[PDB]
Amino acid sequence: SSDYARDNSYTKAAEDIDAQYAYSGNDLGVTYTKDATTFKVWSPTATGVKLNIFTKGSDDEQGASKVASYTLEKMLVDGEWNGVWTITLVGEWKDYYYTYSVTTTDTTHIGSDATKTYETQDVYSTATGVNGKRSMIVDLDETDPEGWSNDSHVLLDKSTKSSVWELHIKDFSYDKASGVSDANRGKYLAFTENGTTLNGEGKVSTCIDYLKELGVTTVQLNPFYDFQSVNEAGDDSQFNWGYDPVNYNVPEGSYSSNPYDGKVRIKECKEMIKALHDAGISVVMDVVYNHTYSTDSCFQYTVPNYYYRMKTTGAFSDGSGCGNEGATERAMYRQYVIDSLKYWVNEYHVDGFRFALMGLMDVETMNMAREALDQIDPRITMWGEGWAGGDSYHPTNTCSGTKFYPATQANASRLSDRIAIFNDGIRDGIKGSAMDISDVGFIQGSKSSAKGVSYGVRANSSGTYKWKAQAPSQCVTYDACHDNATLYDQIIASTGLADYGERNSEAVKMNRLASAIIYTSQGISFTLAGEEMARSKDGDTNSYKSAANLNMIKWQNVVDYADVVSYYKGMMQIKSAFSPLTAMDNSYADKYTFTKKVSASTNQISFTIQNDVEGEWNKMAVIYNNATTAADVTLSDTSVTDWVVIANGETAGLDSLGEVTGSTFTVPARSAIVAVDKAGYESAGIHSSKGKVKVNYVYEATGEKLEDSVILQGSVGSGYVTVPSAVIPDTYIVSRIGGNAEGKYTSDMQEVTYYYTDYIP
Numbered sequence: 226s227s228d229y230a231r232d233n234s235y236t237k238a239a240e241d242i243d244a245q246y247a248y249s250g251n252d253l254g255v256t257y258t259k260d261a262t263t264f265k266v267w268s269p270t271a272t273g274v275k276l277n278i279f280t281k282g283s284d285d286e287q288g289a290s291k292v293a294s295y296t297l298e299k300m301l302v303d304g305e306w307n308g309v310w311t312i313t314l315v316g317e318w319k320d321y322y323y324t325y326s327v328t329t330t331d332t333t334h335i336g337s338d339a340t341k342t343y344e345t346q347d348v349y350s351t352a353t354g355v356n357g358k359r360s361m362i363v364d365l366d367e368t369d370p371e372g373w374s375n376d377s378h379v380l381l382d383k384s385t386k387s388s389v390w391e392l393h394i395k396d397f398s399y400d401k402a403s404g405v406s407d408a409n410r411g412k413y414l415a416f417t418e419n420g421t422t423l424n425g426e427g428k429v430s431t432c433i434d435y436l437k438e439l440g441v442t443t444v445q446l447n448p449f450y451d452f453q454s455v456n457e458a459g460d461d462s463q464f465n466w467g468y469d470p471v472n473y474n475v476p477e478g479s480y481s482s483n484p485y486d487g488k489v490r491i492k493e494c495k496e497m498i499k500a501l502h503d504a505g506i507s508v509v510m511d512v513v514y515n516h517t518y519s520t521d522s523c524f525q526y527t528v529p530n531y532y533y534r535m536k537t538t539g540a541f542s543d544g545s546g547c548g549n550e551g552a553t554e555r556a557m558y559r560q561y562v563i564d565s566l567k568y569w570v571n572e573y574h575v576d577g578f579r580f581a582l583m584g585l586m587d588v589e590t591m592n593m594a595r596e597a598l599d600q601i602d603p604r605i606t607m608w609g610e611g612w613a614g615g616d617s618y619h620p621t622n623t624c625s626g627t628k629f630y631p632a633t634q635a636n637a638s639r640l641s642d643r644i645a646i647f648n649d650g651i652r653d654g655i656k657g658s659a660m661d662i663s664d665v666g667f668i669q670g671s672k673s674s675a676k677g678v679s680y681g682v683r684a685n686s687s688g689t690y691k692w693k694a695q696a697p698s699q700c701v702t703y704d705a706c707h708d709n710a711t712l713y714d715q716i717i718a719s720t721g722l723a724d725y726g727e728r729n730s731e732a733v734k735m736n737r738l739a740s741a742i743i744y745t746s747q748g749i750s751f752t753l754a755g756e757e758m759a760r761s762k763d764g765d766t767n768s769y770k771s772a773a774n775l776n777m778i779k780w781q782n783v784v785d786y787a788d789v790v791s792y793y794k795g796m797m798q799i800k801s802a803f804s805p806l807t808a809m810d811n812s813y814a815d816k817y818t819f820t821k822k823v824s825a826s827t828n829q830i831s832f833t834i835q836n837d838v839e840g841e842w843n844k845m846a847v848i849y850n851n852a853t854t855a856a857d858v859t860l861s862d863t864s865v866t867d868w869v870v871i872a873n874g875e876t877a878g879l880d881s882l883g884e885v886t887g888s889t890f891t892v893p894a895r896s897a898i899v900a901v902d903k904a905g906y907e908s909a910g911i912h913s914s915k916g917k918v919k920v921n922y923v924y925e926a927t928g929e930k931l932e933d934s935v936i937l938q939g940s941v942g943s944g945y946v947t948v949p950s951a952v953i954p955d956t957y958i959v960s961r962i963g964g965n966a967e968g969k970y971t972s973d974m975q976e977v978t979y980y981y982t983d984y985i986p
């Protein structure tokens with residue numbers, strides 16, 4: 226998978242088009258007023274453009290008809306054409322649908338009568354009907370929900386303070402146990418529902434209330450731009466991630482209550498974002514400018530062979546692996562992408578972007594995009610995949626006359642340090658190769674996978690292993706995303722400890738260890754939505770068009786893995802409390818002291834971090850143990866000999882779990898230790914405001930434990946639900962319960978004992 230600079234008649238032509246016709250004007254699309262509406266289409270290849278007006282978005286709908294057709298005239302400046310077609314219809318034209326008929330040549334046959342006519346929606350569509358075939362004239366202020374003018378961006382001071390929850394809108398609430406109303410399940414409006422509980426039983430929180438409690442800073446949403454792969458008129462059981470773009474600046478219709486009325490999806494999309502903002506959560510949008518679903522697109526139908534990268538042979542370059550790739554190096558696609566980003570930020574109050582196959586997008590465009598978004602607010606986050614999905618064929622230079630560079634990991638040094646790149650280094654290091662679900666990483670016991678973790682600990686910004694980030698700010702730290710297998714599915718497949726979606730005590734230990742690594746590592750901490758509750762896709766390693774009920778978040782898991790949720794919740798608090806871990810720059814690189822060589826093949830990774838921030842802990846000690854037995858780990862750094870443990874295999878948080886004197890720590894099997902200096906802990910005054918519930922499993926006759934006790938942890942006053950241990954053999958059954966199996970967290974710890982007796986199933 227490589228990139229190749231090849232100049233040819235298509236690239237030659239497109240460059241000449243940019244020289245003459247490039248339009249920096251800021252009014253492409255509809256310019257609606259109550260008095261009149263002006264339409265504008267950029268097409269230097271066209272000989273004529275007609276405007277077609279309709280009553281409805283599709284012909285099937287009630288009262289569907291065509292109002293009239295009009296002819297656009299060339300926009301002349303001092304009797305010179307600037308490449309833009311225009312027309313102004315005087316009167317009220319809101320809530321009417323429209324589409325252009327573009328008679329045009331290709332880029333390499335301008336001036337000839339080798340023309341074709343295509344019917345297409347507006348390239349700069351702000352709204353469309355069902356299945357995005359017809360554009361809609363809309364007053365955008367009519368789509369504003371209640372108090373939208375009072376809705377601000379939710380931005381982090383530092384991107385490296387984030388905790389990203391990568392979520393699909395359908396997956397969020399499609400499960401009936403979500404407790405979300407019948408109308409809104411798997412829809413935009415699901416986010417607006419406060420007070421949702423598991424099976425609406427009013428005992429444990431789900432959806433938005435669950436996120437408030439978990440304490441995630443950021444929700445990254447899978448494509449909610451308009452895509453092809455769901456029929457918006459069809460059945461509700463349809464599923465797709467939606468990496469199949471059609472209209473870039475239009476919400477997806479499937480996630481709305483009514484896709485036929487183009488305004489409805491816009492309103493409900495804003496209500497989703499307002500809800501997340503009101504919950505104090507930042508919203509990142511997954512964007513896919515790297516390709517469109519088909520070359521039968523609004524871009525091609527307007528200006529054929531301009532917007533896509535063309536090979537010498539006339540074939541579309543297939544760098545995406547999806548049939549085409551967007552020519553970001555072109556003047557009017559660069560501008561489109563940058564204008565698109567600004568639109569979503571300004572109109573929909575989007576706080577950041579995850580760029581799909583950023584490696585197919587040229588570095589200059591990305592830095593220009595960073596600079597443009599900086600003008601709004603530099604806290605607006607940017608990150609993406611620093612790779613392609615195939616071979617890419619591009620021109621030597623951009624439309625600026627600077628050399629084309631793809632925004633890959635290899636070219637991280639040429640890319641803004643506030644455009645982060647997914648660190649597959651630490652990903653593969655933690656839980657094994659993402660390309661093979663059965664492959665083992667560090668947590669399953671791979672010693673050679675340790676170096677991947679150790680380099681990931683400093684966001685692959687200290688030394689070089691596979692790739693190098695400029696700083697932690699340019700690194701997304703993660704163990705799994707929507708692609709490939711979930712963390713827990715890979716744990717299961719690679720070990721064979723149980724079936725997919727089945728709880729196993731050793732698997733959970735490995736899951737907890739992954740948590741400890743992610744939140745004692747530098748960079749932008751990132752997880753798949755439900756990693757904290759051992760999310761499973763039943764071994765599906767590419768669930769892009771798999772069943773909806775397979776993909777959906779199983780909300781029963783907030784109870785079944787409540788202890789795992791509690792662990793992540795605590796680990797998150799540790800990172801947010803300790804500044805070195807959330808550093809943007811390389812200030813703390815030389816403050817790390819690894820016990821063993823960073824590249825060591827080892828069962829036990831350990832290091833200390835010297836802090837310099839007053840009012841915080843002075844020094845943190847982190848140990849990862851992947852051995853099946855407990856290990857005594859002696860730190861090479863002996864400067865501190867008085868420690869307070871704030872994380873172990875049982876729990877993580879801001880509270881003391883015991884003290885250690887000296888430089889040696891006994892680390893349990895398949896577990897992490899996080900400790901901080903005694904003096905620092907005492908002075909800083911960083912303490913937990915969360916309650917705890919200890920769950921025990923005892924054989925009543927002997928009084929002996931059948932399974933290790935676990936810890937739940939949550940806000941004082943918030944509801945918890947405990948359950949019997951799923952892994953205890955079927956020859957025992959619960960006979961009696963001590964303490965409150967269900968209740969609210971208190972400041973003082975509560976205990977729940979499940980008393981077991983002999984059983985024969």
Ligand SMILES: OC[C@H]1O[C@H](O[C@H]2[C@H](O)[C@@H](O)[C@@H](O[C@H]3[C@H](O)[C@@H](O)[C@@H](O[C@H]4[C@H](O)[C@@H](O)[C@@H](O[C@H]5[C@H](O)[C@@H](O)[C@H](O)O[C@@H]5CO)O[C@@H]4CO)O[C@@H]3CO)O[C@@H]2CO)[C@H](O)[C@@H](O)[C@@H]1O
Binds near residue numbers: 469547610614708
């Ligand atoms: O045949 C005529 C037709 O050809 C082109 O378009 C074709 C492609 O050539 C075909 O390959 C096919 O495309 C399929 C893929 O084959 C199929 O794998 C799938 O792609 C999925 C991935 O499976 C899925 O993993 C996901 O990948 C995402 C990642 O999740 C995301 O993290 C990352 O950022 O982005 C990648 C994708 O780049 O999503 C993709 C896409 O949904 O589905 C596609 C689409 O069906 O079929 C198309 C369409 O026929 C020409 O483009 C077209 O003009 C011509 O008519």
Ligand SMILES: OC[C@H]1O[C@H](O[C@H]2[C@H](O)[C@@H](O)[C@@H](O[C@H]3[C@H](O)[C@@H](O)[C@@H](O)O[C@@H]3CO)O[C@@H]2CO)[C@H](O)[C@@H](O)[C@@H]1O
Binds near residue numbers: 613660
């Ligand atoms: O193409 C995008 C892709 O890039 C990265 O994948 C690389 C892997 O990290 C690397 O191991 C290797 O993958 C090989 C598999 O391990 C092996 O099982 C077999 O399938 O051959 C593969 C060679 O292609 O190479 C790829 C890069 O080509 C990144 O980690 C992925 O997330 C991403 O999808």
Ligand SMILES: [Ca+2]
Binds near residue numbers: 451455
């Ligand atoms: Ca759609």
